Design a protein around this ligand. Structure first.
Ligand SMILES: [Mg+2]
Ligand SMILES: [Zn+2]
Ligand SMILES: [Zn+2]
Lengths: 231, 156, 78, 96, 1138, 293
RNA sequence: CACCCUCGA
DNA sequence: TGCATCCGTGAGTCGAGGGTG
DNA sequence: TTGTGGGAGCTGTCACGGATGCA
């Protein structure tokens, strides 16, 4: 919690006795919480390394036409489009499977390009708001993954070589800034990666239909009448 | 998974994990989380054993399921599953990797009962036995390169 | 008894003495084989004679004379 | 002696026949070693007769002490005269 | 200011705003008072009788009273113990440290035996054993090493209630446990279902009504007391049986699984479990706690302290009413006791066992094991042929004392880096250990700072590592209650009038009152000037209260602070992390050849140094009669003499040098308590842990980048950071299976040049200079006939020189170690010396090194600002002031502001102020800033000695004013402006640096982390004979671990051949490593790696578990992993000339 | 389903369930359960030997009871005790309270040799101690290039000991190789002028724990420096998370040509400039440089 | 050999 | 035979110094 | 191989999943 009495003094003026005694509590709590957080991070990193160490690049191209749709930008009612913040983590460093239609004949990208910064800027200037890219999820590689579906290598900047073991690199990349997650936090990451039924379970819609809300006392009741004619 | 299909659960999990790592303000590209998620959907549950020797409810590889279906359709109710990284690591084909990872006693008992023979082709397996790992410079196409000067340079 | 041996010590013990070796080479092959089967390995005299398919007298005489030659040739104690 | 190029590794339950086949002998006594002489006791947990000789090419009672007599077994103590490096690969057994 | 309580103490003018109404107590009393209570010393006798306790019972006296008498089964004979007496010490402290003995004294007891049948009495004096004694420094000597017994934090015995939310139903469940000082626990828990179960000795939960009826309470009598509570009624409705004897036999059937029951044995066992003082004992602390928590008896009768039935009924009623929650609770006879759950970490419920109580608890086990043998011999020995001597066996008592002082977690190797480290180690409080909590049970809640730690346990000083919060230093003014509770002093206030009466309060007695603050305004009459005062409340509530409700007031600021923490100037200007780091790094500073008291300090250095013990203090007033580098002889006023011997170049436990030097001259008159000679880190009486260095705060060519530090080469040339490090090497000649070893100079195959520094014995000569690999002691060992090489066998058979066959096992100097040989100690078996079995001779050689400051050595100030030395520039390259004075150390700017230790900048400003001196402008009175604090600080000469007490001392405005009064240098120039900065000149180019840089004087320490101790490398060395991997540790010349994460990194790189080389030919391959060495020596290519031996070990260990593991070939063929027999003989026969 | 998962495995190619019961207990060789000598005639106790000793004692007492015709109650007690002792030998503490030793410590069972962080797999198979490796405190040394590092003279001499011995025998400083070893150990001044030659273009690996990503190990070209500290380029700190508040780093020496090539090409310092996680620059000017610019 | 204590990043 | 309980897993890396059984 | 005799230690950890044992 937060104590109702704060530490009003600055460390230039010098804290009083009680201000110092109260600050020490939080200081030591933070030290101990970091001591536990680093261990949890190490455990998760080890589990990821073990679950992903059979994932290496084993061929040049999956040749699959499947992919994942990435959102490059969304637009206001005004002509100005807002740049999607995920471009660096979702769109950048990918290879696309379907060329940008651009609403005209102009195909702004060839199938399999690097999608570097100039490609992203050219797609944003043309007015294309969504793209489809090759994804490691939709690869049909028999063993491991393919270089073209994976994307460029972050370190080298070029297309990933074959011998690269992207599984361990991915586990390290995910687990290295693990000691920075503070309190919905790192336990949430563990709950997701361990495929656990969440603490607070919010159900989803089972089928398209018309909803019916029933408000009782501390207990709701939602009933959806489906379109297929079933129960 | 059971409502919207696996290609949607992959997006959901990647989005949630990246949502946490962005709430803390960390630049992690989605491809790493996708590489991790890909291994959580590599198995399927058998509802009806059918003509194969799979036990129902047991988790078998998807490619293995399809390939052994082709062998028995030449002479089968599979449902995609989402399992945790621990349960996926313990379900590997190499008993040595599973024994070195976690829960050694149980893994060893189960492997002895089923008389498991480890194919001995994995990163951790080759590490344990002291063999060149099957990655990087250990891949066959890289490790068996032949090198000799050209004749034009051999003359000089 | 045996210490904690490094690969360095193990590889260096596998090398020849280079001083007793020369003295063994200076003796004729007969004296050399005689003293090898007598003092190095530890065979009895009759067994050494059976190995060399020669009588006892020649084995013993070669042993004694090669011993004297090696004693006069080495003369190195520490 | 090994090129680290083999196909597979196999595990399974070992039968009592496999256990006795592995073993080079049976331990009958809880004794470890004679404390006055620092020598292993016969039919014990460290017995040289079943496990192997502690010193290279040396039997228990001291009859054969050199590499000259190798591969043979001393008839007075039953100790095989060979390298002591076999004391880490020769298992025993206990008949219950 | 003067602080003249210590005679001859140097004058350290203080910025203290307030006056000290109570002085710092004996810093070592936490050890000495406990030990003196254990012994029964006249000091403790007078103190206890004077302190108000007219019940003097020593620890040994208590154990003997509890043991006496020892009656037999027949009741015919009895043995009583009395009068614990100590004979004089066996050997002095230095003698015991020299001869690997334990400083001890004999223990005698008067053992009176009485035979009732014949009615005869035989007293005697029996020898109990050698009781190890505590030195004057509060430490022990065990087997020649100095040790400290750290006080252990343990929960006090008593009844404790706790609140636990339900796992599923969320319904709050209240549990309670009764924990004795010794005996069986007693737990009472409520369940999810409305049942009240009693868990006795952690057996299956039985209904509480079973125990109630087992005590004899009938059904109608049991329903009455718990009538208002329906949970007890609901449990009685769900009860299994109903009755007294049936409940007794039910308890017996529960407590003993697989046993036919009986009502007689049931009654006897249930009575013996909790109500017999033999098997069960609630200590005086436990009885006090239960009588204060249940209000059973207020007349304070200490007798009958074992699980009274009314106490059990009162605990059950407390629990059932706690589920309700009524404040007022009164058992029949009780007195208005509140109902609430107990805080386990509150220092009222968390006591500490000091050294005396731990030794007493070990002696208790020893004496019980002795009593067993006593009663065993009573039956088998013929009467009238027995004496108290024959009945008593002192073997288990000696074994228990030895086991405690040797293997207990609370007996610790003393930290002897400097006086401060040991002083804090003796006042340290540890939570782990036997009797308390283990490490896996140490949750985050036990480690946090508690409000009851205020003035008892310092919150700042605690380790950073996995022992964080589990280890904490006692507060300055605190002391330990006879019950084991930590008390603290407060000034009593009477209707807003603060008095000079000091009262010591425990954690319980403090939460009942209102404690004021030390910095509250107080007039000369002793009353609060302000109408309201800021105070602390029961639960740690800080609030403003009118001055008429104040009960007590803090005796001083820094009352919540430890010794080490109270030595950080401007503590309140530092965050707790860096303050903790500074307090922990003050104990890691090494002693330097010359000590230098800090230019800016606190009031703690003086008394901390004198109470540490490494300083020489006069026991009685007199005139010095003689002074030598070896001793000081004083002549008292009554004619008696006294002499103090000097520790000269004495090695510490951690290799630091303990050296003492006299600070008095012949003819001087010294008072009782004055410092006569300085210790390792003492300068004229005060803790001098480091040096005052001229520091400039600026980035300099990246050599101070990222906490690196730049030093002036002057510090190397003048030896201002040079220290002395002594190391003790040891070797023994003993007996082997082939014969006896001999220490001799005659070494086979060694030149006479290498043995040049050896005497006739083969020992190096005193004063010789030895380097890496030099011989210290020559030793030869009878050579095993089996390992005789074929060449050696051929030589011994040809020449027949079968005389004095040996091999070289001589002691050598480890890698990276050199220095001058200081001394040689030698013990022989020919001469009568105590040596272990088969050890004929033992020789120790002491080597000292003068280490100057160097690259990579670790420096640090008092504010948590640490750093290694990146570059030491020549004195010309160093930036210098206007008058050509070069700075000594350059600390980078980027470090300071982000760590939140601004105290270093203030220390630097005040250090320049004290180095150059000042004079406040007296024209037109005293300025407004210099009016409040400074009285004698209005002027100060150059190199003045000043102190800024923490939570007191120099205010920011006063430092700002002093920065203007800076006296000029010898040339009339004021080098430092009022901003604390100065124009420096780049000593490399010459052009002056553009902007002014903050310069001043800072106290810098030399931490005990030096490159000479840490650098290590290993091409090839020893291997562990089990897994055949390289050994570990710099001392064993071991290799570096390539852990799992390193292999992950190597794989992520894809460097397969590197990873294989690291795991096969560098670690495990027994034929591949020698092959690699042979290939590198002959300049050939590196061969192909083989199979790791640890994998073969794994296979064999799997086979040990009845697991048939077999490596298969390409197609189902069993592969044999073996050696090859004749692969070695070919090269041998070839190099012998076959 | 759960029961069939067990039965169907036994239903194949012999593999009788009889193996789950033992008529003979295998004994691990003595070298894997050593016994060393202490001071005063004391001996060290391998827990495995104590467990085997309890098993053998109880088996012998059981045989002596059988032959003596004891009451079946006592023989059953002895059979139960033998079963429990074998259970402890195989996995102690798995069932019931563990078997204690000196100080009530649980005896390390045969299962403990493989379980846990310090078992065989994780402690001796996945990671091992290596030869030709050392460690030391790191200092900054901003003068060297990105691909270089400062290596103390003593460290470099110890690491390349066989290389410097070979080069000392190449030239006539040493007559034979054993004299070369003695000369290197005595640190005679002829070695140093040789050392600088054998170091040229021979990369080393620098590692700092915890190795969180692959950049925690990087290859550098060693430059001989004076002192006992490892000079570390100020740009790689962001990759190593290494400050100079007392940090230590370890040096590994690759020997084989493939390993040296992997160091020069795959692990070279100047080759890894970008974070493999986000592609952002890591060798970028970090704090001081920043202000300087 | 195993276990324990303290400490460093 | 339907769950609540109990039990059996897992919980950071590397390094330095000192002990004893 | 004979009047009597029953341990030392400790829960002061938290989260999770699935076989176990019971109502
Ligand atoms: Mg650091
Ligand atoms: Zn693909
Ligand atoms: Zn024999």
């Amino acid at each position: 919690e937060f104590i109702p009495r704060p530490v009003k003094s600055s460390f230039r003026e010098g804290l009083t006795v009680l201000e110092y005694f109260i600050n020490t509590h939080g200081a030591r709590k933070g030290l101990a919480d970091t001591a536990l957080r680093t261990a949890d991070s190490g455990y998760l990193t080890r589990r990821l390394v073990d679950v992903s160490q059979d994932v290496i690049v084993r061929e040049h191209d999956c040749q699959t036409e499947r992919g994942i749709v990435v959102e490059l930008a969304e637009r206001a009612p005004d002509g100005t489009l807002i740049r999607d913040p995920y471009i660096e983590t979702s769109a950048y460093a990918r290879t696309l499977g379907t060329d940008a239609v651009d609403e005209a004949g102009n195909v702004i990208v060839e199938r399999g390009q690097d999608l570097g910064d100039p490609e992203i800027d050219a797609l944003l200037a043309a007015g294309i708001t969504q793209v489809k890219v090759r994804s490691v999820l939709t690869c049909a590689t028999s063993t491991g993954v393919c270089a073209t579906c994976y994307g460029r290598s972050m370190a080298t900047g070029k297309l990933v070589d074959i011998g690269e073991a992207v599984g361990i690199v991915a586990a390290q990349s995910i687990g290295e800034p693990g000691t920075q997650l503070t309190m919905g936090g790192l336990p949430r990451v563990q709950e997701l990666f361990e495929a656990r039924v969440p603490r607070g379970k919010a159900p989803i819609a089972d089928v398209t239909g018309r909803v019916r809300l029933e408000d009782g006392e501390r207990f709701y009741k939602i009933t959806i009448v489906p379109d297929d004619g079933g129960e | 998974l059971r409502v919207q299909g696996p290609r949607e659960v992959q997006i959901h999990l990647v989005r949630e994990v990246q949502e946490v790592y962005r709430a803390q303000g960390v630049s992690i590209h989605d491809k790493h989380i996708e590489v991790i998620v890909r291994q959580m959907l590599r198995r399927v549950t058998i509802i009806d054993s059918g003509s194969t020797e799979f036990l129902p409810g047991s988790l078998i590889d998807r490619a293995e399921f399809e390939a052994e279906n082709r062998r028995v359709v030449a002479e089968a109710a599979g449902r995609p599953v989402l399992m945790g990284i621990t349960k996926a690591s313990l379900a590997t084909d190499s008993w040595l990797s599973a024994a070195s990872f976690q829960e050694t006693t149980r893994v060893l008992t189960d492997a002895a009962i089923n008389c498991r023979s480890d194919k001995l082709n994995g990163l951790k397996e080759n590490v344990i036995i002291g063999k060149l790992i099957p990655a990087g410079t250990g891949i066959n196409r890289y490790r068996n390169i032949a090198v000799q000067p050209t004749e034009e340079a051999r003359a000089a | 008894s045996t210490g904690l041996r490094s690969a360095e010590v193990e590889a260096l013990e596998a090398l020849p003495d280079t001083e007793i070796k020369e003295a063994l080479q200076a003796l004729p092959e007969e004296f050399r084989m005689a003293v090898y089967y007598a003092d190095v390995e530890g065979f009895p005299y009759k067994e050494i004679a059976e190995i060399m398919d020669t009588p006892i007298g020649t084995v013993m005489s070669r042993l004694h004379r090669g011993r004297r030659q090696l004693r006069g040739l080495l003369a190195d104690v520490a | 002696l090994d090129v680290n190029f083999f196909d597979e590794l196999r595990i399974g339950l070992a039968t009592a026949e496999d256990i006795r086949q592995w073993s080079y002998g049976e331990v009958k006594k809880p004794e470890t070693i004679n404390y006055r002489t620092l020598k292993p006791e016969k039919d014990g947990l460290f017995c040289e007769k079943i496990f192997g000789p502690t010193r290279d090419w040396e039997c228990y009672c001291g009859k054969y002490k050199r590499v000259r007599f190798k591969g043979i077994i001393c008839e007075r103590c039953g100790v095989e005269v060979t390298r002591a490096k076999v004391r880490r690969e020769r298992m025993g057994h206990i008949e219950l | 200011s003067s602080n003249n309580s210590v005679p001859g103490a140097p004058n350290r003018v203080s910025f203290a705003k307030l006056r000290e109404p109570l002085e710092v107590p004996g810093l070592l009393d936490v050890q000495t008072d406990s030990f003196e209570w254990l012994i029964g010393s006249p000091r403790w006798r007078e103190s206890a009788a004077e302190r108000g306790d007219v019940n003097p019972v020593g620890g040994l006296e208590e154990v003997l009273y509890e043991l006496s008498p020892i009656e037999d089964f027949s009741g015919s004979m009895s043995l009583s113990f009395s009068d614990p007496r100590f004979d004089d010490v066996k050997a002095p402290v230095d003698e015991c440290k020299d001869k690997d003995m334990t400083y001890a004294a004999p223990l005698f007891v008067t053992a009176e035996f009485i035979n009732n049948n014949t009615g005869e009495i035989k007293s005697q004096t029996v020898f109990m054993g050698d009781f190890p004694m505590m030195t004057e420094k509060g430490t022990f000597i065990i087997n020649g090493t100095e040790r400290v017994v750290v006080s252990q934090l343990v929960r006090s015995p008593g009844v404790y209630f706790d609140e636990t939310i339900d796992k599923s139903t969320d319904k709050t469940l209240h549990s309670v446990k009764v924990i004795p000082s010794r005996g069986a626990w007693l737990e009472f828990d409520v369940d999810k279902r409305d049942t009240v179960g009693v868990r006795i000795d952690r057996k299956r939960r039985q209904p509480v009504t079973v125990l109630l009826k087992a005590l004899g309470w009938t059904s109608e009598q049991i329903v009455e007391r718990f009538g208002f509570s329906e949970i007890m009624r609901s449990t009685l409705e769900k009860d299994n049986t109903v009755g007294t004897d049936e409940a007794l036999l039910d308890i017996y059937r529960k407590l003993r699984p697989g046993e036919p029951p009986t009502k007689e044995s049931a009654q006897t066992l249930l009575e013996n479990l909790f109500f017999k003082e033999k098997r069960y004992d609630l200590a005086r602390v436990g009885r006090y706690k239960v009588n204060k928590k249940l209000g059973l008896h207020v007349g304070e009768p200490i007798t009958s302290s074992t699980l009274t039935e009314e106490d059990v009924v009162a605990t059950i009623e407390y629990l059932v009413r706690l589920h309700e929650g009524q404040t007022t609770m009164t058992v029949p006879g009780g007195v208005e006791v509140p109902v609430e759950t107990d805080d386990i970490d509150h220092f009222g419920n968390r006591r500490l066992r000091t050294v005396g109580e731990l030794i007493q608890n070990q002696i208790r086990v020893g004496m019980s094991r002795m009593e067993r043998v006593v009663r065993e011999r009573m039956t088998t020995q013929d009467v009238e042929a027995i004496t108290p001597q024959t009945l008593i066996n002192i073997r288990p008592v000696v074994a228990a004392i030895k086991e405690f002082f040797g293997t207990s977690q609370l007996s610790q190797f003393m930290d002897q880096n400097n006086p401060l480290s040991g002083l804090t180690h003796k006042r340290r409080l540890s939570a782990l250990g036997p009797g308390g909590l283990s490490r896996e049970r140490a949750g985050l809640e036990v480690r946090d700072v508690h409000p009851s730690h205020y003035g008892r346990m310092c919150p700042i000083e605690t380790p950073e590592g996995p022992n964080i919060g589990l280890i904490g230093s006692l507060s300055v003014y605190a002391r330990v209650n006879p019950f084991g509770f930590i008390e603290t002093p407060y000034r009593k206030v009477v209707d807003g009038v603060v008095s000079d009466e000091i009262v010591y309060l425990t954690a319980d007695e403090e939460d009942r009152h209102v404690v004021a603050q030390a910095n509250s305004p107080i007039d000369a009459d002793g009353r609060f000037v302000e109408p309201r005062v800021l105070v602390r409340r029961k639960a740690g509530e800080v609030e403003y209260v009118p001055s008429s409700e104040v009960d007590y007031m803090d005796v001083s600021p820094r009352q919540m602070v430890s010794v080490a923490t109270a030595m950080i100037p401007f503590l309140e200007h530092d965050d707790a992390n860096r303050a903790l780091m500074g307090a922990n790094m003050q104990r890691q500073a090494v002693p330097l050849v010359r000590s230098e008291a800090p230019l800016v300090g606190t009031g703690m250095e003086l008394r901390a140094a004198i109470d540490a013990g490494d300083v020489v203090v006069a026991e009685e007033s007199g005139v010095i009669e003689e002074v030598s580098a070896d001793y000081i002889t004083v002549m008292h006023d009554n004619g008696t003499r006294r002499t103090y011997r000097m520790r000269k170049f004495a090695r510490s436990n951690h290799g630091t040098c303990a050296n003492q030097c006299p600070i008095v001259d012949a003819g001087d008159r010294v008072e009782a308590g004055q410092v006569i000679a300085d210790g390792p880190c003492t300068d004229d009486g005060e803790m001098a842990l480091g040096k005052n260095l001229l520091v400039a705060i600026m980035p300099w060519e990246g050599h101070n980048y990222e906490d690196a530090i730049i030093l002036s080469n002057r510090l190397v040339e003048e030896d201002v950071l040079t220290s002395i490090h002594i190391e003790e090497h040891e070797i023994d000649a003993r007996d082997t299976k082939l014969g006896a070893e001999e220490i001799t100079r005659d070494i086979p195959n060694i030149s006479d040049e290498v043995l040049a520094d050896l005497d006739e014995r083969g020992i190096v000569r005193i004063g010789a200079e030895v380097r890496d690999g030099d011989i210290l002691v020559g030793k030869v060992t009878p050579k095993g006939e089996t390992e005789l090489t074929p060449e050696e066998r051929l030589l011994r058979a040809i020449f027949g020189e079968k005389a004095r066959e040996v091999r070289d096992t001589s002691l050598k100097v480890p890698h990276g170690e050199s220095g001058k040989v200081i001394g040689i100690r030698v013990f022989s078996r020919e001469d009568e010396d105590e040596l272990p079995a088969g050890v004929n001779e033992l020789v120790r050689v002491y080597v000292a090194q003068k280490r100057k400051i160097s690259d990579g050595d670790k420096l640090a100030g008092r504010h948590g600002n640490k750093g290694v030395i990146g570059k030491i520039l020549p004195v010309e390259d160093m930036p210098f002031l206007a008058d050509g004075t070069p700075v000594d150390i350059i600390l980078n700017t980027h470090g300071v502001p982000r760590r939140m230790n601004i105290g270093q900048i203030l220390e630097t400003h005040l250090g320049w102020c004290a180095h150059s001196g000042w004079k406040v402008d007296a024209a037109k009175g005293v300025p407004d800033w210099a009016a409040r604090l400074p009285d004698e600080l209005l002027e100060a000469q150059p190199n003045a000695i000043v102190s800024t007490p923490v939570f007191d001392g120099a205010q920011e405005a006063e430092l700002q004013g002093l920065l203007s009064c800076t006296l000029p240098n010898r040339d009339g120039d004021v080098l430092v402006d009022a901003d604390g900065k100065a124009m420096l000149f780049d000593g490399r180019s010459g052009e002056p640096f553009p902007y002014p840089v903050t310069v001043g004087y800072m106290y810098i320490m030399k931490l005990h982390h030096l490159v000479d101790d840490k650098i290590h490398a290993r091409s090839t060395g020893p291997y562990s004979m089990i897994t055949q991997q390289p050994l570990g540790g710099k001392a064993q010349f071991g290799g570096q671990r390539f852990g799992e994460m390193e292999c992950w990194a190597m794989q992520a790189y894809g460097a397969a051949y590197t990873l294989q080389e690291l795991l096969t030919i560098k670690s495990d391959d027994t034929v591949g490593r020698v092959k690699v060495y042979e290939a590198i020596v002959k300049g050939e290519n590196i061969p192909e790696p083989g199979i790791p031996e640890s994998f073969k070990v794994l296979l064999k260990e799997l086979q040990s578990l009845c697991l048939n593991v077999e490596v298969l070939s390409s197609d189902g063929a069993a592969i044999e992993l073996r050696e090859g027999e004749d692969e070695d003989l070919e090269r041998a026969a070839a190099n012998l000339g076959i | 389903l759960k029961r069939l998962k067990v039965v169907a495995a036994f239903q194949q190619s012999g593999n009788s369930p009889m193996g789950m019961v033992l008529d003979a207990v295998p004994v691990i060789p003595p070298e894997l359960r050593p016994m060393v000598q202490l001071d005063g005639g004391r001996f060290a106790t391998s827990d495995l030997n104590d467990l085997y000793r309890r098993v053998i004692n109880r088996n012998n007492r059981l045989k002596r009871l059988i032959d003596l015709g004891a009451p079946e109650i006592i023989v059953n007690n002895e059979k139960r005790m033998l079963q429990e002792s074998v259970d402890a030998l195989f996995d102690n503490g798995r069932r019931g309270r563990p078997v204690t030793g000196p100080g009530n410590r649980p005896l390390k069972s045969l299962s403990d040799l493989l379980k846990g962080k310090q078992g065989r797999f994780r402690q001796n198979l996945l990671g091992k101690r290596v030869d030709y490796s050392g460690r030391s405190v790191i200092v900054v040394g901003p003068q060297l290039k990105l691909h270089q590092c400062g290596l103390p003279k003593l460290m470099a001499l110890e690491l390349f000991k066989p290389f410097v011995m070979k080069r000392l025998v190449d030239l006539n400083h040493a007559q034979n190789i054993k004299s070369a070893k003695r000369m290197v150990e005595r640190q005679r001044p002829q070695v140093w002028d040789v050392l600088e030659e054998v170091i040229a273009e021979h990369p080393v690996l620098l590692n700092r724990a915890p190795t969180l990503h692959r950049l925690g190990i990087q290859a550098f070209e060693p430059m001989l420096v004076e002192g006992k500290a490892i000079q570390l380029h100020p740009l790689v700190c962001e990759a190593f998370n290494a400050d100079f508040d007392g940090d230590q780093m370890a040096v590994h020496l690759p020997l084989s040509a493939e390993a040296q090539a992997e160091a020069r090409i795959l692990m070279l310092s100047s080759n890894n400039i970008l974070s493999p996680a986000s592609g952002r620059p890591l060798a970028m000017p970090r704090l001081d440089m920043v202000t300087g610019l």
